[PDB]
Symmetry: D2
Subunit: 256 residues, 4 copies
């Protein structure tokens, strides 16, 4: 496997529909040694779910908290000497930020929170994980959406938070490059996950991608997972600060 022996932390695994689940399946297939995080109460749920990946550790991490993130790496460091990659597959904005007219709905705190969790958390993981990642062709990958690049209905302040995220990925790539850490993002097309039901427009978005996309289909978590996997491999060491669209080609067309 092209990830054989690599030590990789996966965030955001919630159900077997999660993009993180596809990433896990892909990386496990390729020989990676995998660890996982969960938020507070989903402990036993995620614990059962990720067992099938022979995890080196399953640890709590609500990225809201500087403490939990710091402790995540303290505990992870009791299990692993160093770390090969961090996979960031997590976002959040209050529900009222994801419906209706953007200007009607947006609020100062919702904006703040969407950004705190969906964008800042990526650089926070980088900050704490850096020491374990130093000097080993380490990698980071974040999940984003085309809502960052173009305005669209519903996605609203999450769209704005994704743009912050993509920029954070670029600045993170610049900052950590000297340590041989590559930092990239996968821009995934619409996939029916738990988080997706939180988007007003989702059924429409999903249907629309299939019709308009060049490949005339929706993507799945294995296409996404496989791409994230590659981006944590030695084959991808020339790639950094990049956004790769895994969206059946939706990003390259206009009209349809």
């Amino acid at each position: 496997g092209f990830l054989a022996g690599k030590k990789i932390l996966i965030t955001g695994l919630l159900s077997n529909k999660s993009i993180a689940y596809g990433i896990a399946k892909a990386m496990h297939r390729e020989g990676a040694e995998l660890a996982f995080t969960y938020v507070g109460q989903f402990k036993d749920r995620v614990e059962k779910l990720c067992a099938e990946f022979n995890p080196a550790a399953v640890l709590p991490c609500d990225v809201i908290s500087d403490q939990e993130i710091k402790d995540l790496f303290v505990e992870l460091g009791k299990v692993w000497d160093g770390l090969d990659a961090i996979v960031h597959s997590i976002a959040f904005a209050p529900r009222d930020q994801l419906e209706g007219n953007f200007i009607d709905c947006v609020t100062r705190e919702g904006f703040s929170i969407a950004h705190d969790i969906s964008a800042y958390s990526f650089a926070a993981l980088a900050k704490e994980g850096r020491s374990m990642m130093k000097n080993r062709n380490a990698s980071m990958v974040a999940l984003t959406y085309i809502g960052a690049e173009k305005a669209m209905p519903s996605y609203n302040t999450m769209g704005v938070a994704k743009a912050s995220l993509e920029a954070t990925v670029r600045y993170t790539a610049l900052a950590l490059g000297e340590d041989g850490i590559k930092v990239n993002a996968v821009s995934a097309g619409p996939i029916k996950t738990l988080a997706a039901s939180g988007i007003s427009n989702f059924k429409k978005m999903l249907d629309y991608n299939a019709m308009v996309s060049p490949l005339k289909k929706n993507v799945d978590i294995m296409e996404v997972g496989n791409t994230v996997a590659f981006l944590c491999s030695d084959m991808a060491t020339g790639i950094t600060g990049e956004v790769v669209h895994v969206d059946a080609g939706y990003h390259c067309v206009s009209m349809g």
Copy 2:
């Protein structure tokens, strides 16, 4: 004047050198009726600066506060029947967010504050000004910088907040379009302003720009101001969600 009669609110006027000053000069030349905001204790400084423009109002507004933004437009509603444009020329991030390695310097709070004042404040002005701007070919312009698009040394968290601001400009353009309101940004090249002091490598950027850009020069506040004035005129009613680079062409080249 191609702004004759138009009622425009200008934020960010701090000194003789502010970009907002160039904007003000340009719009006053073009027949605009102007209002200005100030923060903190700069009431006298700003009144003195903007006196030559015969402003209708010089009002307090620290965009950290929702109430002040709300009261700004209530007071404005007392001198003006309606608003033609809002010029957003305001940004802030704590000094420790603008020096050294991005991952070293980044903090949750500094991230939050940068986004809150540099980006959220644009949508906040849009939210409270919206009713006065409805249905008169109204306009909004924000000031951004190429650090939103590309990572660069030192700009760090502001770079990320600027990416957030540009996405906010797009979603705002989408949200306000049905009201005939166009929403755009001007991406200015480095100009020597008071804020530029907070950029550790600023003299670097300025000299680099002049040497590398096609027009082999630095831009000035009138170049930026004229462009902002244009983007508030009836000539630009076909343009929204756009970012216009006023940077002597720096944006279009690679190497020099």
Copy 3:
């Protein structure tokens, strides 16, 4: 007028529906001294049409021919000492390049011809006009379409030619910057012109822009013309290598 006394050459004027016609109206309004080109047989047609703009010259120029382009500037130079701007508002691809599946329809020669006329002609005009434009804040503007940036049905090899054009604009901006010549493009939304009937998809494209665009409308030749006018003014001397979308905001959104 903000173009008062400026000497500007306009190409592509064919009917009073032409984008070039809007550009002419706008620049004449702003005090510009205007000259025009035509292709071979449209001589008397264009001659009648542009009379209303008090043209300094109306000259033949089929950009297919290196000879006619060279002679255009020889004759123009008998009338004007120097030249302030060139407006390129011309494109062509064989009809069979603009219908159906791109791969089915595209041909080596059609590709060549689309590029020769729609892209190369811009740099050819720059090459010959340069000497008259030297050292006077001169300008060039080309018309493009979003078909360059994104693949779309029908537009096909014209889309590919527009991408070449936009790149030619950037390389031209780099090359001529040292002479103080600024070089930009306006990316216009769909407008019902003569050339438009040559596009299979046009009615659909037109209708689709109105529904999806933030400003919920189609643009007109005066919005486009006014923007081109501004881009040939002293107000725009900080702008070069830029593409400005005048498309009611279509470019910034996804879905609708």
Copy 4:
């Protein structure tokens, strides 16, 4: 191997240092069955180079000729029941198009030739290969360069042709998508190849890249080859119309 069984045609193999050589090494390692084309008198040189790959066929194809491209696929149809991928790793422009000021150097013919071989030839391969690639998760990859996106010294007409090639990649992706064929490009950083000799400022670009890019290094043909191999694999079936930068992050930064 993640290309096991896949039948892939590789163009552009000229030497030990060609990018096509890195691509070939990577795909042979991953289980691909390979074929190669050559131009002119390099039949013996290429057969000798690609012998270790146990190619199914080493065939003549100068992409200036439609007939040769047509006959290529007829001959290929004699060894293979179907084609899984085409690697386009080929460009050309006359030397006088790659030195000095772009406007000084550009000619109609040099423009035409650059586009014809560097860009049109990609769609031409797509046209004639299409029937063998139908409905097998087939793939196309072209090699491009950041000179398509930004203007830079010397690259000149090739820069423009590369912009044309990237648009062709998008329209081809749109056209071939219904056939399950994904179409992408790899944007490689400067690598020391035979062609690089024709770039007057190449040692400039190479040293600049290593100093300025986040990973503080130059890319190599295996980094590019691995990525191209990935883009021909079943793992990448969610990706089309994409451009992936394999440039040590150069694309994402500004200043250094």
